[PDB]
Amino acid sequence: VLKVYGPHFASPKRALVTLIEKGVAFETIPVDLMKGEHKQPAYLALQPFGTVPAVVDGDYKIFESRAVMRYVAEKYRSQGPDLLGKTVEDRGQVEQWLDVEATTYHPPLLNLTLHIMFASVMGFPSDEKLIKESEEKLAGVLDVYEAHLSKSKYLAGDFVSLADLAHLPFTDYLVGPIGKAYMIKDRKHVSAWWDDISSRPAWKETVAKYSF
Amino acid sequence: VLKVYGPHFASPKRALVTLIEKGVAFETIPVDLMKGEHKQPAYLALQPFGTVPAVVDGDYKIFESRAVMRYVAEKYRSQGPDLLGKTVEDRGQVEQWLDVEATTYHPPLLNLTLHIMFADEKLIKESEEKLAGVLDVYEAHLSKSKYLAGDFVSLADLAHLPFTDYLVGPIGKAYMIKDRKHVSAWWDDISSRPAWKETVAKYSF
């Protein structure tokens, strides 16, 4: 009966894949960003910043895609894989790389998404300069990942976690519609790691059900 | 003893104030940007992105200021105030507003900080407007809720301290807080807490 708003967009898929990994029953509710449903009063009561996702769970409301990941992972900690790790220290590392995704990986990748995939939304002429800068910044981030993932199977250690999962929705864009698969492929450890998490059954199901 | 790198910068103070709220012993170690210490190998082995803070706790290394806040609050959960709330739902709201601070509140305020304190007139106007929109939402929320995550002070409130300190001081835009009655009452509360006053006395500029 848990409900996810806006499943066709990328951020909500962070929540979707966590839910599916955890075997949690849920439903989705469409939100029309193009016509501005997300900026109208009905949706602003759930998410006051007017962005997707938002989750409604019984009496409970929560937004911010990674906060939703953490909440699902904690509420359902005792079933499925432990996406938060086993110890406090393990969880520190999950938190660490989740924050890296939010503050450091995602922002330039967001710029690439917006200006290549949704250029119309950003207006013309397109910012070719910001596109170059964002590609450069993301490559630097990826260089760190390549070194790191050569010493660790997943981001937070030897277990898949929220931190890995958080990279799924927009990196899927990067290697597909954005047209920059080489940024992943040219970095061997990253590429094996990418191949691992994006072929996980939960992610395959997320994509089958909540695209287009 | 736990060690924090770069206490004079704003972002590490999120970790410093959490440590002091929780009554945890720690030491700090300076990072010299002017000499590029942060881009040299020793420091990159602690923090591979070359930014502050970096925290070492015995053999355990952890970075990202809010990740450190969570780690400290979990590890020392049973002492001091509980900055994580009591329930899972409680903690969900702390995570929600922590992410709001990171993804929505801080980026325009970081822009104001870089361009007013450490130097683009247009980007300043745009970022102020963006932050004002963010603050309007906080104003509405803090009317129905004493602190961000509910009726208890939490990591989410504390995460706002260091750069907002800049906003009401050196950046010169205190009116953005003061003109909003609930936001302003909230700021007066959390920024008057002894742990933050002690952080500021010890680690400002």
Ligand SMILES: N[C@@H](CCC(=O)N[C@@H](CS(=O)(=O)O)C(=O)NCC(=O)O)C(=O)O
């Ligand atoms: N930090 C938020 C950001 C969410 C967000 O920006 N969502 C976008 C859609 S997507 O990038 O995730 O696919 C949105 O609602 N955009 C609408 C708008 O800002 O007008 C989160 O992770 O939940």
Ligand SMILES: N[C@@H](CCC(=O)N[C@@H](CSO)C(=O)NCC(=O)O)C(=O)O
């Ligand atoms: N464009 C807005 C943000 C939209 C966004 O974050 N993301 C994509 C969806 S990625 O799955 C988006 O633009 N959606 C709107 C649409 O599809 O029209 C802005 O100017 O800030």
Ligand SMILES: [Br-]
């Ligand atoms: Br949708």
Ligand SMILES: [Br-]
């Ligand atoms: Br310092």
